Chains A and B, each alone.
Chain A
Amino acid sequence: SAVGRGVTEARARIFGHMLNPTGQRSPHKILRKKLIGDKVAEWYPYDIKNEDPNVLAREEKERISKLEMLKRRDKGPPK
């Protein structure tokens, strides 16, 4: 039976591969990856206390309370 021979011309394989018959290392593995720009760079998460003007101007208000208490004894930092 020559049918069992000729019944295989399968080279197209429309499934969507990219092909190299000899195999030079190819710019395929540099673009297979899921991209490394944004997801890692968004790693530092956020505490709401940048909002809430009622913890804002309060934390820093206590900082300047320390500023006043140390200014009283003048041991603060000059320029």
Chain B
Amino acid sequence: AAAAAAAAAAAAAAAAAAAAAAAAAAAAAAAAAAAAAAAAAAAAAAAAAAAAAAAAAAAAAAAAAAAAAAAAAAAAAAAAAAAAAAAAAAAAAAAAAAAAAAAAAAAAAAAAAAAAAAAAAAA
């Protein structure tokens, strides 16, 4: 949801600490659990279905600030040439601007570059 309200933004677009790191959470809280490791193993063999349902009744995942990078590359690919000597300046402008509006649907914010490429190929 919101945050830990303890640490600053530690993101820096770092990584995904894979599962079974519950070794640490066993050091911390297995103190109220049992002497099995296949216990957690079956917890995972069910958390697969739990993840199915979580993504079903939760969302469809929202990616990253890497949308900026994929959109800048979409702009570089819309020109894909040395055609107009001004179409490229236009595309750079369009990327650096369109990536600002705080609501413009993040998928059309890529399909716009896609359509730029489309009519540039038709051009």
Contacts and interface: CB of A to CB of B under 8 A. Distances in A.
Interface string A11-49: 000001010000000111001111100000000000000
Contact of A26 (B93, B98, B100, B105): B93
B105 A31 contact: no
B93 A18 contact: yes
Contact of B96 (A18, A32, A33, A35): A18
> Which secondary structure dominates chain A's binding surface?
loop
Contact of B97 (A18, A33, A35): A18
A27 B101 contact: no
B32 interface: no
Interface in B55-111: 90, 93-94, 96-98, 100-101, 103-105, 108
A34 B94 contact: no
Contact of A34 (B90, B93, B96, B101): B101
A34 B103 contact: yes
B104 to A, nearest CB: 6
Contact of A28 (B90, B97, B105, B108): B97
Nearest to B95: A18
13 contacts: A16-B100, A18-B96, A18-B100, A26-B93, A27-B94, A27-B97, A31-B94, A31-B97, A31-B101, A31-B104, A34-B101, A34-B104, A35-B108
Interface of A: 16, 18, 26-28, 31-35
Query: Which 9 pairs of residues, A with B, have the shortest CB-CB distance?
Result: A18-B97, A34-B103, A31-B98, A28-B97, A18-B96, A31-B97, A35-B104, A32-B101, A16-B100
